[PDB]
Design a binder for this molecule. Structure first.
Ligand SMILES: [Ca+2]
Length: 421
């Protein structure tokens, strides 16, 4: 819609069945214990009648589904009370490149422009035993049923909101089956279900699609939050990128909660790049013209909650208030070389982490070129560029300060669940 669009992967029993043997082996080792989440960021989100831009060369699959739409702030929603937090339901389309791997986040596959049609919210009581239909050029092409999903809408809302607060207007896509249908330029793709107005979108060669969807600017932070995995040589083939939901963000001198009964929660000091101008298919050579400037984040992780499905997964990386971020942006013109800046972390005044952006594996221009090659970057989007070596455990009472030379100083305080409540 206009809120964050969350989605669940591996929720349809047909896919769990199909992947059973693979999930016993590297790199998965074991089947998912918890829900496997992803996000369809704002560049993806379109309404009925808007085109799905088709990337030349690629195979693209429709992903008819339905989404629950949150009607009031949802934090630790109890399963039995879910309906009272759900405004209704909307037909949606998880448009995607093939789901060939579930190990690393599927950003190229799923976060392309216009890859998330979503329709009208309808006030139904439930979506139990609902057949979701796909038609292509007005011919029946696919159907599946929500009774075959592992977690129902109630259970998904409860499971996600247990650690990630949802705001009114946010959505959760309930899932998709193993078997999907292919779309191609010229196709008209229609999603249908009893009780809903059909959702229809044309698929168009991307070369033909006019200007990209723009958004109103709002005070930083506001935008897609991209984050890098391993990005310091401290002494891979392509970047590991994942997205962070906006409710993870908190300001300066706030608190971040350490879960009860875990072994390891660590800070991560990072240079954050903020986009200043809409960017698509930007070369490394002009990438810097699209940067507004720089800020700092503390990209916390709960190492205990890591799994090998879309890793690092949302239960580790999108927890409420576990991403301190400064509200100030230093303009790029104040920083002559962002690839020559010191990063440090202090805990209670003890220096625990130090490195330099000279050790970035993937440079700021590389990253901008890499992402804009397959999706539109918009003003206010953020790129958390990774963290050097020097991680350690932090516990309630601890004051954690991260600092990037010339960019800013960011304070945070760890607290217990008991203190925060
Ligand atoms: Ca990180």
């Amino acid at each position: 819609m206009k809120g964050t669009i969350f989605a669940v992967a591996l929720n349809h029993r047909s896919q769990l069945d199909a992947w059973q043997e693979a999930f016993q082996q590297s790199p998965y080792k074991a089947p998912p214990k918890t829900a496997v989440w992803f996000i369809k960021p704002r560049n993806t989100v379109i309404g009925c009648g808007e085109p799905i831009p088709f990337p030349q060369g690629e195979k693209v699959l429709s992903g008819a589904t339905v989404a629950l739409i949150v009607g009031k702030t949802a934090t630790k929603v109890r399963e039995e009370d879910a309906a009272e937090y759900i405004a209704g339901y909307a037909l949606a389309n998880d448009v995607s490149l093939p789901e060939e791997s579930f190990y690393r986040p599927a950003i190229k596959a799923k976060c392309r422009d216009g890859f998330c049609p979503i329709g009208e919210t309808v006030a139904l009581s439930n979506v139990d035993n609902l057949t979701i239909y796909t038609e292509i050029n007005g011919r029946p092409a696919d159907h599946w049923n929500t009774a075959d999903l592992q977690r129902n809408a109630a259970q998904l809302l409860s499971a996600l909101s247990e650690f990630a607060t949802l705001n009114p207007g946010d959505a959760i896509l309930l899932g998709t089956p193993q078997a999907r249908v292919e779309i191609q330029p010229g196709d008209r793709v229609r999603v249908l279900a009893e009780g809903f107005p059909p959702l229809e979108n044309p698929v168009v060669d991307e070369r033909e699609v006019t200007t990209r969807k723009s958004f109103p600017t709002l005070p930083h932070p506001h935008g897609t939050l991209f984050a890098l995995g391993l990005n310091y040589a401290d002494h891979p083939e392509e970047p590991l990128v994942f997205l962070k939901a906006p409710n993870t963000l908190t300001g300066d001198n706030q608190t971040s909660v350490r879960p009860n009964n875990i072994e390891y929660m660590h800070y991560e000091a990072e240079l954050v790049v903020v986009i200043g101008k809409q960017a698509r298919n930007v070369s490394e050579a002009d990438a810097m013209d699209y940067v507004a400037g720089y800020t700092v984040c503390n990209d916390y992780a709960i190492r205990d909650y890591l799994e090998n499905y879309y890793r690092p997964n949302l239960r580790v990386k999108s927890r409420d208030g576990l991403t301190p971020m400064l509200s100030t942006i230093v303009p790029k013109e104040a920083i002559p070389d962002p690839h020559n800046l010191t990063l440090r972390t202090f805990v209670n005044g003890e220096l625990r982490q130090q490195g330099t952006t000279a050790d970035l594996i993937f440079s700021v221009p590389f990253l901008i070129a890499y992402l804009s090659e397959f999706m539109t970057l918009n003003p206010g989007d953020m790129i958390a560029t990774g963290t050097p070596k020097g991680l350690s455990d932090v516990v309630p009472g601890d004051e954690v300060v991260v600092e990037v030379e010339g960019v800013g100083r960011l304070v945070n305080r760890i607290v217990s669940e008991e203190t925060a409540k």
